[PDB]
Amino acid sequence: PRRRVVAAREILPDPKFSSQTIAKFMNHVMQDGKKSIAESIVYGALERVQEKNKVDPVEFFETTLEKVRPMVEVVPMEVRPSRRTALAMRWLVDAAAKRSEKTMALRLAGELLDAAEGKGAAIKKREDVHRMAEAN
Amino acid sequence: TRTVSEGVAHIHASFNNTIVTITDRQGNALAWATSGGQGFRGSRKSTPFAAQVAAEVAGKAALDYGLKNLDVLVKGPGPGRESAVRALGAVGYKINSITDVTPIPHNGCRPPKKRRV
Amino acid sequence: QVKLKEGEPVDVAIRRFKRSCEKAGVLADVRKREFYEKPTQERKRKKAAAVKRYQKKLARES
RNA sequence: AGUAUGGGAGAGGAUGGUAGAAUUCCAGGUGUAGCGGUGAAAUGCGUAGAGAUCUGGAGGAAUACCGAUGGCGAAGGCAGCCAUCUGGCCUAAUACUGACGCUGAGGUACGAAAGCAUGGGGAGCAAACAGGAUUAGAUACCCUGGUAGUCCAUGCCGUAAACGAUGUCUACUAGCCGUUGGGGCCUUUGAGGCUUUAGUGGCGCAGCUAACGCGAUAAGUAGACCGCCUGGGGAGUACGGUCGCAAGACUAAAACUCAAAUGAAUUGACGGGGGCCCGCACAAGCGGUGGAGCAUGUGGUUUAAUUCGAUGCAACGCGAAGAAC
């Protein structure tokens, strides 16, 4: 602003898992107010990862998020925690968009599973940030 | 081929460049690198990052001759003196002593005219 | 002649040397040597410095 | 006002030696692809080897720190250290001469920098000039080079915002705070505190001034002598003369033309002056336009007519909330 400090806007927990992380991911996926489509996409992927490995959807998602989380931007300085997660979700949706499959939910589940082993364009971009950070 | 344990580093840091020269004692050159030799053409030659890059290359080159402890002399009011001296420790030498040897005239020759920019 | 003792780090050595050079003030002479200063300008600058010094002394006295 | 005797401070002057730092060049080792420079570049230097680093040599010019609102000198000016020759100033007490004083038209001496003459010297810097940039153009500012000159000896020139924009000499008129060179007193042991004198600074009463300001270093109160001014231009110009090798300097008008030209301060406005502050101004984000097809308005062109108005932001889906008659 210039004079004031504006508080962050608190988002409600997801009504199905009570997960603010899942709610934020849904908000990142959603376009032009179509919340139902984003909910379907996210829930389908959460069920798919559960079948393809029997793991808890919430814990598996947090672990993959922490794996794809950067640590630094760029002038080196320490990125604040919220921006880390905000940047990780953007990479995870962008890279998932470019796979070839029938539905967005299946692509999201597939690349979540792929990133759980460190294989994916998001992790590659993370290594790129690591390299250019070593540059500075 | 020649092996020497104790060496001297010279950081000539001007406002347009920085030259890092590694020699033994009695001033016989062993390895050197400048910001111009790693790209960084034009005005970017004076950045501290280029000085660090040149210092790393020079230290790694001298590691072949096999120095472990060295004495550092910095001359010139360059922006890359601190980066050049820091990069040597990162490379892995032991800086026994580091000093400033910039020359000062005792009211000698006349310097050039002032720029009316 | 910053001679390091047994176990200071490189950064500590750098900062201590920077403090020593700041105390020595060699860079001021190097900057002064870049261009020629005419005696008129030198006298004007020294007169201004003396005036500022005397103004500072009265302020510190009060 | 001056003289003799003791002591003191100082980049005062002239001559001759000598020391260290640094720049340039040269010779030689180590060593290998850049160096240099700018807002960004380029001209330029370099593989017949630079730049960097080490050793030695040559030469010229200037004296870091001390360094100071310090010091000395009539002014111009004077800074490493040492010797020789030499001028002035401050300070104490007696002694001595007895108005020997102040100013000064003509005259005469000194007089920054640039410039001139004869002979030397030449590191760095650098008018003129050459090239590279920038620009609509660049003749300039910026960059790479570079000759006079800057230095020495012997002479000339005689001008500067040569300024404190304040002629020299004398006496008197509240105070407060610094600093330089001396004298005296007091403590009391060694560092301080009071006075007095000659300089050098900052405030300020009275007084003065158009105001700004000055104010014992007067622009106050008075006295002595000298120089100079009489609206702005033409004009420190022409003619004549004197001086100078020259460049030029000094003395110095008129015709003609205008009703102004100036000083200080006040209110605004502006500044590619400075501080502080705000705004989707930027920063962080999410969507667009600029590309395609179509709708609509404008410019242009065309036409018998393509009715008229709106033109940077603040005109262009605007007047028109609706042209087949």
Helix/strand/coil percentages in chain C, nearest 5:
75, 5, 25
The single-letter code of the amino acid at B109 is C
For chain A, the straight-line distance linking the first and the last C-alpha, in angstroms and rounded, comes to 30
Q: Which of B 41-60 have CB under 7 A of nucleic chain D?
A: 41-45
| E strand residue ranges, C1-62 | 2-3
The token pair that represents C31 in the structure block:
């900057």
Which of C34, C4, A133 lies closest to B85, judged by CA? C4
Q: What is the C-alpha separation between B98 and C10, in angstroms, rounded?
A: 10
All structural domains of chain B with their residue ranges: 4-117
Which residues in chain B have their CB less than 8 angstroms from residue C10's CB?
A: 85-86, 88-90, 95
| C40 CB within 8 Å of a chain B CB | no
Which residues in chain C have their CB less than 8 angstroms from residue B99's CB?
A: 1-2, 17
Q: Is the CB of B1 under 7 A from strand D?
A: no
The token pair that represents B48 in the structure block:
């501290």
The token pair that represents A56 in the structure block:
């808890």
Resolution in A: 2.3
Q: If interface means Cβ-Cβ distance under 8 Å, which residues of chain B face chain C?
A: 76-77, 82, 85-86, 88-90, 95-100, 102, 104-105, 110-115
**Helices and strands (H, E) in chain A, number of each type:** 6, 0
Q: What are phi and psi of B32, to 5 degrees?
A: -155, 155
Nearest to C34 among B88, B95, B111 (CB): B111
Q: Which of A 38-77 have CB under 7 A of nucleic chain D?
A: none
Q: What residues pair up with B71 in beta bridges, in sequence order?
A: B8, B97
Q: Is the CB of C51 under 7 A from strand D?
A: yes
Q: What is the C-alpha separation between B110 and A13, in angstroms, rounded?
A: 76
Q: What is the C-alpha separation between A88 and A97, in angstroms, rounded?
A: 14
SS (H, E, C) chain A: CCCCCCCCCCCCCCCCCCCHHHHHHHHHHCCCCCHHHHHHHHHHHHHHHHHHCCCCHHHHHHHHHHHHCCCECCCCCECCHHHHHHHHHHHHHHHHHCCCCCCHHHHHHHHHHHHHCCCCHHHHHHHHHHHHHHHC
What DSSP state is assigned to residue A72?
B
Q: What is the C-alpha separation between A61 and A43, in angstroms, rounded?
A: 12
Which of B112, B2, B115, B12 lies closest to B58, judged by CA? B12
Angle at B43 between CA B37 and CA B48, to 5 degrees: 70
Which experiment gave this structure?
cryo-EM
Which residues neighbour B58 within 8 Å (Cβ) at sequence distance 6 or greater? B9, B20, B21, B22, B31, B32, B33
The single-letter code of the amino acid at C19 is R
Q: What is the C-alpha separation between A129 and C57, in angstroms, rounded?
A: 55
The single-letter code of the amino acid at A107 is R
Which residues neighbour B62 within 8 Å (Cβ) at sequence distance 6 or greater? B7, B22, B30, B31
Q: What residues pair up with B29 in beta bridges, in sequence order?
A: B23
Q: Is the CB of A119 under 7 A from strand D?
A: no
What DSSP state is assigned to residue A120?
S
Q: How many of the other CB atoms lie within 10 Å of CB of B27?
A: 9
The single-letter code of the amino acid at A97 is A
Which residues in chain C have their CB less than 8 angstroms from residue B88's CB?
A: 10
How many residues are recorded in chain A?
136
Which of C31, B69, C10 lies closest to C18, judged by CA? C10
Q: What is the C-alpha separation between A111 and B9, in angstroms, rounded?
A: 51
Angle at A79 between CA A73 and CA A83, to 5 degrees: 95
